[PDB]
Design a protein around this motif. Structure first.
Motif, PDB file in Angstrom:
ATOM      1  N   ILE A   1       0.824  -1.208   0.000  1.00 23.04           N
ATOM      2  CA  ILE A   1       0.000   0.000   0.000  1.00 23.04           C
ATOM      3  C   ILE A   1       0.860   1.260   0.000  1.00 23.04           C
ATOM      4  N   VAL A   2       1.937   1.288   0.782  1.00 20.24           N
ATOM      5  CA  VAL A   2       2.845   2.439   0.723  1.00 20.24           C
ATOM      6  C   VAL A   2       3.296   2.682  -0.714  1.00 20.24           C
ATOM      7  N   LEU A   3       3.690   1.610  -1.407  1.00 26.04           N
ATOM      8  CA  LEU A   3       4.181   1.745  -2.773  1.00 26.04           C
ATOM      9  C   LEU A   3       3.095   2.243  -3.721  1.00 26.04           C
ATOM     10  N   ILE A   4       1.887   1.679  -3.633  1.00 27.64           N
ATOM     11  CA  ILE A   4       0.790   2.102  -4.503  1.00 27.64           C
ATOM     12  C   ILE A   4       0.482   3.582  -4.289  1.00 27.64           C
ATOM     13  N   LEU A   5       0.382   3.994  -3.024  1.00 23.26           N
ATOM     14  CA  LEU A   5       0.093   5.391  -2.729  1.00 23.26           C
ATOM     15  C   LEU A   5       1.153   6.304  -3.322  1.00 23.26           C
ATOM     16  N   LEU A   6       2.422   5.954  -3.137  1.00 24.92           N
ATOM     17  CA  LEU A   6       3.502   6.776  -3.667  1.00 24.92           C
ATOM     18  C   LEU A   6       3.436   6.850  -5.189  1.00 24.92           C
ATOM     19  N   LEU A   7       3.161   5.724  -5.849  1.00 30.84           N
ATOM     20  CA  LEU A   7       3.108   5.731  -7.303  1.00 30.84           C
ATOM     21  C   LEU A   7       1.929   6.523  -7.837  1.00 30.84           C
ATOM     22  N   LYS A   8       0.900   6.721  -7.024  1.00 28.82           N
ATOM     23  CA  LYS A   8      -0.262   7.512  -7.393  1.00 28.82           C
ATOM     24  C   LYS A   8      -0.218   8.910  -6.795  1.00 28.82           C
ATOM     25  N   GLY A   9       0.958   9.372  -6.389  1.00 24.68           N
ATOM     26  CA  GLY A   9       1.156  10.778  -6.115  1.00 24.68           C
ATOM     27  C   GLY A   9       1.080  11.198  -4.669  1.00 24.68           C
ATOM     28  N   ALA A  10       1.092  10.257  -3.731  1.00 28.22           N
ATOM     29  CA  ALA A  10       1.066  10.652  -2.327  1.00 28.22           C
ATOM     30  C   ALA A  10       2.233  11.579  -2.013  1.00 28.22           C
ATOM     31  N   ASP A  11       1.948  12.586  -1.207  1.00 28.12           N
ATOM     32  CA  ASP A  11       2.944  13.535  -0.751  1.00 28.12           C
ATOM     33  C   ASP A  11       3.789  12.864   0.321  1.00 28.12           C
ATOM     34  N   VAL A  12       5.022  12.529  -0.041  1.00 27.72           N
ATOM     35  CA  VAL A  12       5.875  11.774   0.846  1.00 27.72           C
ATOM     36  C   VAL A  12       6.245  12.589   2.071  1.00 27.72           C
ATOM     37  N   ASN A  13       6.110  13.917   2.010  1.00 24.97           N
ATOM     38  CA  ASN A  13       6.512  14.804   3.098  1.00 24.97           C
ATOM     39  C   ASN A  13       5.332  15.431   3.830  1.00 24.97           C
ATOM     40  N   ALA A  14       4.154  14.855   3.692  1.00 23.36           N
ATOM     41  CA  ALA A  14       3.012  15.317   4.459  1.00 23.36           C
ATOM     42  C   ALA A  14       3.312  15.189   5.940  1.00 23.36           C
ATOM     43  N   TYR A  15       2.779  16.111   6.741  1.00 23.52           N
ATOM     44  CA  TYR A  15       3.004  16.051   8.175  1.00 23.52           C
ATOM     45  C   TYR A  15       1.701  16.147   8.942  1.00 23.52           C
ATOM     46  N   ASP A  16       1.667  15.451  10.073  1.00 20.06           N
ATOM     47  CA  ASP A  16       0.467  15.387  10.892  1.00 20.06           C
ATOM     48  C   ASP A  16       0.520  16.495  11.941  1.00 20.06           C
ATOM     49  N   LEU A  17      -0.404  16.474  12.886  1.00 17.44           N
ATOM     50  CA  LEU A  17      -0.481  17.591  13.835  1.00 17.44           C
ATOM     51  C   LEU A  17       0.769  17.718  14.718  1.00 17.44           C
ATOM     52  N   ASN A  18       1.648  16.714  14.722  1.00 10.02           N
ATOM     53  CA  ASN A  18       2.908  16.723  15.459  1.00 10.02           C
ATOM     54  C   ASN A  18       4.118  17.002  14.584  1.00 10.02           C
ATOM     55  N   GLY A  19       3.905  17.412  13.347  1.00  7.18           N
ATOM     56  CA  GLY A  19       5.007  17.532  12.428  1.00  7.18           C
ATOM     57  C   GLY A  19       5.616  16.220  12.002  1.00  7.18           C
ATOM     58  N   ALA A  20       4.958  15.078  12.272  1.00  8.35           N
ATOM     59  CA  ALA A  20       5.521  13.789  11.899  1.00  8.35           C
ATOM     60  C   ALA A  20       5.190  13.475  10.453  1.00  8.35           C
ATOM     61  N   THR A  21       6.203  13.096   9.699  1.00  5.89           N
ATOM     62  CA  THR A  21       6.010  12.620   8.341  1.00  5.89           C
ATOM     63  C   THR A  21       5.860  11.115   8.349  1.00  5.89           C
ATOM     64  N   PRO A  22       5.464  10.535   7.220  1.00 12.23           N
ATOM     65  CA  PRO A  22       5.423   9.074   7.158  1.00 12.23           C
ATOM     66  C   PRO A  22       6.774   8.434   7.462  1.00 12.23           C
ATOM     67  N   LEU A  23       7.889   9.098   7.112  1.00 14.09           N
ATOM     68  CA  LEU A  23       9.213   8.559   7.430  1.00 14.09           C
ATOM     69  C   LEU A  23       9.429   8.467   8.938  1.00 14.09           C
ATOM     70  N   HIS A  24       9.014   9.490   9.685  1.00 19.27           N
ATOM     71  CA  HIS A  24       9.128   9.419  11.136  1.00 19.27           C
ATOM     72  C   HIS A  24       8.358   8.230  11.669  1.00 19.27           C
ATOM     73  N   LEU A  25       7.126   8.054  11.185  1.00 24.54           N
ATOM     74  CA  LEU A  25       6.272   7.008  11.728  1.00 24.54           C
ATOM     75  C   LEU A  25       6.818   5.624  11.408  1.00 24.54           C
ATOM     76  N   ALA A  26       7.272   5.419  10.175  1.00 26.32           N
ATOM     77  CA  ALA A  26       7.839   4.122   9.825  1.00 26.32           C
ATOM     78  C   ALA A  26       9.087   3.841  10.644  1.00 26.32           C
ATOM     79  N   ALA A  27       9.908   4.857  10.860  1.00 26.13           N
ATOM     80  CA  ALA A  27      11.091   4.661  11.702  1.00 26.13           C
ATOM     81  C   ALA A  27      10.696   4.317  13.136  1.00 26.13           C
ATOM     82  N   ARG A  28       9.699   5.015  13.673  1.00 30.07           N
ATOM     83  CA  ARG A  28       9.247   4.746  15.030  1.00 30.07           C
ATOM     84  C   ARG A  28       8.773   3.311  15.193  1.00 30.07           C
TER      85      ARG A  28
END
Lengths: 158, 157
Positions: free
Chosen positions: A85-112
């Motif tokens: 699903i991560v791959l499909i979303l990215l290939l369909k234009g997901a903003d890889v640097n979107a941030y949530d109310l804590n400034g967390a990006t998907p990269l932060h969350l996957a690392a966590r």
């Protein structure tokens, strides 16, 4: 109009692939939103239904929709460990640097969550590895904190 | 019923205290849920509307309702830093050691966000300081990782 959207939200949550397809063929609002500002794509990305994610995207789902916490489908898939699903979303234009109310990006969350392959995918897709959350932490820092020193090295992008 | 429950969810999210009261007087389900399994109490705890939290609990809201991610109203209040709501929820029976899909308790979340007074409240309310999340981390570990010396000592044995 409200009704087909509600049916679609329920079908997406339940993982009912053929029902999602019929509802879309009957004109359901692909971006129907509930009180949490969750869309069908959020539900499918959370639960891990890859075919439903793809069908929704083919029908115009907003890949960057944010819920009431600022969470996108990519955040959900990255936290839950849904690699495909991560791959499909990215290939369909997901903003890889979107941030949530804590400034967390998907990269932060996957690392966590210690999802090493997803972290690598997000880097490949252009994630800003130098992005800091509201408290100053990078995915590198999180990976050190989690004992994932090998992944921290890759995150340095050297 | 779907109508009244949806109206109650919307009024709670918007912070409309008198509308919440009237809807409940007219039979709205205090535990109405959306697709995320969010209840009015979740919405009010997230936004920080203390009076609506209190009104919902007076009318029988499930203080331990869990959404689709296993998140309770106390998790939301603890993460957002809503001290008064944390206290009200605890006084009305919230499980201080509820855990979400990641094994995080409210203590983990308050520690991660650096909310020192909420951490102290949760300890006072019976938080399990030895609770580990899905990754083996206690709230003490989180405080160390964040360099929060003050919180570490509060959590140190």
């Amino acid at each position: 109009h409200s009704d087909l959207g509600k049916k679609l939200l329920k079908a997406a949550r339940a993982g009912q692939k053929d029902e999602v397809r019929i509802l879309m063929a009957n004109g359901a609002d692909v971006n129907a939103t509930d009180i949490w500002d969750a869309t069908p794509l959020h539900l499918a990305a959370l639960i891990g239904h890859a075919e439903i994610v793809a069908v929704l995207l083919e029908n115009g789902a907003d890949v960057n929709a944010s819920d009431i916490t600022g969470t996108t489908p990519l955040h959900l898939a990255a936290t839950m460990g849904h690699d495909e699903i991560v791959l499909i979303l990215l290939l369909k234009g997901a903003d890889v640097n979107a941030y949530d109310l804590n400034g967390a990006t998907p990269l932060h969350l996957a690392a966590r969550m210690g999802h090493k392959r997803i972290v690598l995918v997000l880097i490949l897709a252009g994630a800003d590895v130098n992005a800091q959350d509201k408290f100053g932490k990078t995915a590198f820092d999180i990976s050190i904190d989690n004992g994932n020193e090998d992944l921290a090295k890759i995150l340095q992008k050297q």
